[PDB]
Symmetry: C3
């Protein structure tokens, strides 16, 4: 079965759900008006997520793992970038 991770923010709310399937992670999004597939699409067998607000601006961190490597992906308003996280050291 596929594996999911979810986060949400505000009172509308906005929700993001990430799904790992066959080595790829896809993103589904709700901002009050319907579900749509988001811009996040990266490799991974496993996913987790967290998010926080700075005022009205959302910041999202998605942790995508394959083997023993976890890659952090970052949303800070400007598309998906890679983060400084590593699993060790």
């Amino acid at each position: 079965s596929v594996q999911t991770a979810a986060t949400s923010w505000g009172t509308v709310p906005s929700i993001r759900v990430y799904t790992a399937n066959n080595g790829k992670i896809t993103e589904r999004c709700w901002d009050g008006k319907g579900w749509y597939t988001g811009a996040f699409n990266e490799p991974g067998d496993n996913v987790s997520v967290t998010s926080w607000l700075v005022g009205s601006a959302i910041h999202i961190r998605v942790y995508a793992s394959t083997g023993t490597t976890t890659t952090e992906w970052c949303w800070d308003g400007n598309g998906w970038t890679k983060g400084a996280y590593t699993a060790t050291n």
Copy 2:
């Protein structure tokens, strides 16, 4: 091993933990006074969760997956209902 997902809200806090075991998801609840088994009991091999407050009212979304199908379950004060989420399209 079983697979879990957790959410919490407020300062008491309230906590909900969902566990997928043998194709079924069960719910455990803390509201400050002890752990009890919640009303949520639905099929799934995998579970994730998120929640948010609107004032003092909690809203919970549980994403239950079997195969490639993810079903969203909703708490909005009135028992568990199904949501509009789909994994694609």
Copy 3:
């Protein structure tokens, strides 16, 4: 592949990511200045997490599962202790 769970709080933010690998869970931490390995290191094949603030104080609950047993681990400012959670009854 390893399995992760993530939580975050405040606006800095602080982030904690828990990774289950080969029956052990380790913790990675960000408080604004770099990633470091945290004090949490306990057995588990599966992990989930939630956290909440009471004023400026973080409280973290990590649910570590092996077989059908889920152990709750608690941070309340004073190291990692075990919680009252059980999966049933």
